Design a protein around this ligand. Structure first.
Ligand SMILES: C[C@H](CS)C(=O)N1C[C@@H](Sc2ccccc2)C[C@H]1C(=O)O
Ligand SMILES: C[C@H](CS)C(=O)N1C[C@@H](Sc2ccccc2)C[C@H]1C(=O)O
Ligand SMILES: C[C@H](CS)C(=O)N1C[C@@H](Sc2ccccc2)C[C@H]1C(=O)O
Ligand code: NA
Ligand code: NA
Ligand SMILES: [Zn+2]
Ligand SMILES: [Zn+2]
Ligand SMILES: [Zn+2]
Ligand SMILES: [Zn+2]
Ligand SMILES: [Zn+2]
Ligand SMILES: [Zn+2]
Lengths: 486, 486, 243
């Protein structure tokens, strides 16, 4: 059994009937107009993201799912900050593929819908499900481009989507499996499979201690799970000495909050508190697969945050790699602690830019939810590049303020140079960002608080319920454009 | 456009292919085997509750939805306490009708599926949606029996389902619309439309005061919304002097908890705190439509429970109609307060049985959730009758204990004869039931705590998300059988 | 005229969806939206700006009583849209729905509303800046530029259908006065308001985070801040000269 997903646009006022994509019209022609005929008979027109299934139209395609693509000329939506057409395609195709999968069809050919990359992303992101630990699973669906004219674009979409799906897998996987060591090993095998122009160092605790990362170590010690500092190098630049772009990701494989223990409700989701590491590492893996002509370094401090007889204690003062002391008033604000040391280390690479990602604050979720990743940056150039890339990917970013106003609230510290929690409970994502900035001197640094986009329920149509792996594609697009432009 | 819902059973080992119902096979014959042909082509067999849509099979039915009915011989499931076949039909048909509605088809003919009543209930309960206050609504679907051989059974199903839908409407409707007065007027018009052998008395506050219902009055006074004591009579017995069956329902049109105010989260659902009144009144309306040969009296104290300068105050002692004093330690345990007076009044009718329904305790929800209505009764005969009726309707009941063990915890009262909350927080539904029992001397009394079945998310397949109107059909079935048996 | 709308809840107890006792006294400033836009207009008048301005401020208290809004109640806005009041403490958007509808009758050049609308806004940006939701980048830029001068900063927040979807997914009515999820509270609140706006140049300022000052703004003693009144004044001044 082989399924087929075909797109149809919303009817324009000047048109007598909704128009099929080129593939749709061709298939209709192939079946002597039976597709149009049955679609007409089926009832109301298919709107954006809606689907309808027709059976027995062609011996090779017992199941044909037509999906609504919305307005054919839908481009950049000035109000939504994204290319609407691409988003329509991703959603429609995802919906179509899910329908094919529900019919238990193992193979599906997908209409490029005028944008093969978007179509591929919809199919690949849409079909993804982390079901490795389930006895009962949906049929594995192999999605392929319908036709052979948009191959590179289609594969580009598969690549981008696969990068995000890698992040989703890493985030979704339970923490007892996805330990710091396991995460590092999976990223290592993926990066090495992507290109041999790579180096991966799964730095052990001894190295971390040697690097004087007391902040990171303070978080890790509460747990019996060994911490690791993942360092990955992708040497894509023609010039080996070319300064690299450095990505840093919060890799808390599991966050119980530590002594400042979290509430039980939905704490299981904290297995994705390493989403920052997942997204930046996956983006680098994808950059390597794209063979981007740039040098990139990925840094991911990985550990668990657990309560125990040797765990971080509220009030404890720890020393970051840069010598700055930190008062750990709340052990559940551990992401900024490990990032302090990772960000310090990031400067040793004399990077062109430093971008960190982290499921850093619930405040970010309360601020923008899953609508967009919050971006704190001291460079409007960098903000604009990330923003422009997000318009293309649809995985939106929204700028958040890096004001001294917030810095003042974290450096007002009773015992040390900086407190790991603001003196007020307001603007949690902003004070967390201000804290990170105290460990950054680089002129082009961007902090992405992805706590709000850590999961998906139904907000992003082409992502099934679960860890979202956002905004991996936006980072990939950013890297791609940087390798071409910047 | 006219849609068609046809059923197909799960294939038995001895059969070469899954068997259609009589209507399905006949339609297939009508379309020269095209239905079977396309179903075969469509893929995997249809399992219970699953559906698949085929277009253009017949000029009169552009859309045909085949629904899986499960095992043809599925009967009473000893482990689930219900007739599985009927439940399969209700679910499958509901699913089929929802599919027809999504296609925006205004008319649908429904396969009786070997049990027209179950089919009708699935279609009518399944299509129901309270959308009176919405500008955007789904297409109104008119469901009718496919064929003309199972008319009475089909109409019986429509009647039962309509009774439940009336309860759902009353429960779902916002409290500012569904006031005590409005509820009474809607029940009145429905009962009177059902039969002229009825009397309805929308008793005003003056009557309530005359009846010395101090407990009920104490609850109502906090709100500016006038309370009413709905009294409905259905004189179906050939003998006017025949003792009536008396139904009592908690009619709190809105419960804020009063001075013992509720938390904000999901308090909107308390607009259905009159579900007890809704279900028993709807059951009586349906009994009247069925023209059951029995006398039935419905009693529903209706009021709001609001905080104000004259509302019930914790610790206040009120006097029930029977002279018993009640210490109101928690003003949010108001349902038992109004029921105390209604139950007392119920005895004046020298009833054969007294059955009250109420969304009485969150404890009931914690106990059985929406799996079944908790039934507290001092009569195993009555319990068995309710239980047997529930097997048929699928709207299950589960017996809960009326032990002195619980009574002791409510009569251990600091200031009065009985405390409106137990001395311990355990067995909340049982102590609430024990409280009610202090106002009952009748040998055949059953208290139904329907708090757990007040709403539906997806537990009952044939009920869309919202107020469930449960267990209205079980009460109707009980009445029907009582009119025939008892 | 340019039309300004301000949430004027003189006191908010939350109503039946009653607030916690801690610091509820600050809710006497839940009319800050009305205060800032009205004050800005007074100042515009004192500046004798050559423009027509209309100020709209629905004013009332939100109290619990025997006749108060009940969770689940469905009310009808001036534009005929029904609203499910799931949380009576999300009352600012309820009164603004009617005020925003009325604002359109003036065929305004722009519609700007201010409101101490969500605690989510405070959690989002605190007192660092007023959150600005607008369907006009031109309007956003004008407000932003004015804020640079006044120092009473504004920061743009998203008006995405993403949030709209979460408020129009309503059990009983056209729109629910609280999102289906607890995330992005200021954004869903803004989306709710947008359902009562058809104007091409509308800006919603959630000033809940800048309602008070402790010591963040050096030149403001502890207490209600009256922000971002000056930014609105500057905006009006420049509009009277430029736009
Ligand atoms: C998503 C983050 C990172 S794991 C997180 O859970 N935080 C960070 C801080 S915020 C915070 C909460 C209270 C006082 C001070 C700061 C602690 C914890 C929380 O919200 O209680
Ligand atoms: C569903 C019922 C009826 S409205 C309800 O809400 N109850 C009844 C009592 S239980 C209760 C709770 C604490 C102490 C004593 C009794 C009060 C209220 C509640 O759960 O807090
Ligand atoms: C500052 C605003 C306006 S007065 C406010 O207090 N809100 C608005 C809503 S948010 C909200 C909270 C819980 C569920 C749904 C929405 C209610 C109240 C609050 O935070 O509990
Ligand atoms: Na994980
Ligand atoms: Na109701
Ligand atoms: Zn934490
Ligand atoms: Zn964390
Ligand atoms: Zn109550
Ligand atoms: Zn109640
Ligand atoms: Zn409020
Ligand atoms: Zn308010």
């Amino acid at each position: 059994t082989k399924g087929l997903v075909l797109g149809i646009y919303s009817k324009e006022k000047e048109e007598d009937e909704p128009q099929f994509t080129s593939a749709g019209e061709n298939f209709n022609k192939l079946v002597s107009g039976k597709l149009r005929e049955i679609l007409n008979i089926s009832g109301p027109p298919l709107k954006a993201g809606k689907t309808r299934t027709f059976y027995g139209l062609h011996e090779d395609f017992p199941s044909v799912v037509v999906v609504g693509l919305g307005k054919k000329t839908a481009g950049i939506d000035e109000q939504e900050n994204w290319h609407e057409g691409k988003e329509n395609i991703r959603a429609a195709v995802a919906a179509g593929c899910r329908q094919i999968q529900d019919l238990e069809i193992p193979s599906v050919e997908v209409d490029p819908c005028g944008d093969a990359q978007a179509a591929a992303e919809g199919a690949v992101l849409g079909l993804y499900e982390y079901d490795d630990l389930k006895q009962k699973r949906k049929v594995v669906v192999s999605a392929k481009l319908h036709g052979s004219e948009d191959q590179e674009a289609w594969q580009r979409g598969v690549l981008f989507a696969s990068g995000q799906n890698l992040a989703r897998r890493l985030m979704e996987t339970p923490a007892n499996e996805m330990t710091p060591t396991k995460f590092a090993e999976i990223v290592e095998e993926n990066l090495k499979s992507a290109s041999i122009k790579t180096d991966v160092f799964i730095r052990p605790k001894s190295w971390i201690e040697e690097q004087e990362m007391g902040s990171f170590l303070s978080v890790a010690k509460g747990s019996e799970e060994p911490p690791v500092f993942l360092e990955i190098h992708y040497k894509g630049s023609p010039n080996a000495s070319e300064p690299p772009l450095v990505f840093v990701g919060k890799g808390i494989t599991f966050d119980s909050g530590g002594i400042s223990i979290k509430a039980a409700a939905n704490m299981d989701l904290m297995r994705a508190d390493m989403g920052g590491a997942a997204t930046i590492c996956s983006a680098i893996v994808s950059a390597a697969k794209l063979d981007l002509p740039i040098n990139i370094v990925g840094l991911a401090p990985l550990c668990e945050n657990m309560p125990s007889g040797k765990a971080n204690k509220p009030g404890d003062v720890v020393r970051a790699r840069n010598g700055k002391t930190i008062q750990v008033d709340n052990t559940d604000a551990e992401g900024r602690l490990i990032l302090a040391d990772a960000l310090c280390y990031a400067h040793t690479f004399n990077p062109k830019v430093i971008i960190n990602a982290a499921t850093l604050t619930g405040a970010m979720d309360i601020a923008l939810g899953s609508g967009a990743t919050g971006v704190f940056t001291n460079s409007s150039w960098l903000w604009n590049k990330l923003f422009e890339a997000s318009i293309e990917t649809g995985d939106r970013v929204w700028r958040m303020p890096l004001f001294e106003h917030y810095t003042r609230q974290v450096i007002d510290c009773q015992l040390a140079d900086v407190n790991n929690i603001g003196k007020y409970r307001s603007a949690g994502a902003c004070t967390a960002a201000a804290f990170l900035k105290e460990f950054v001197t680089h002129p082009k640094w961007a902090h992405l608080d992805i706590a709000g986009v850590m999961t998906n329920k139904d907000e992003v149509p082409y992502l099934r319920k679960g860890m979202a792996g956002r905004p991996t594609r936006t980072l990939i697009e950013f890297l791609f454009r940087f390798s071409q432009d910047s």
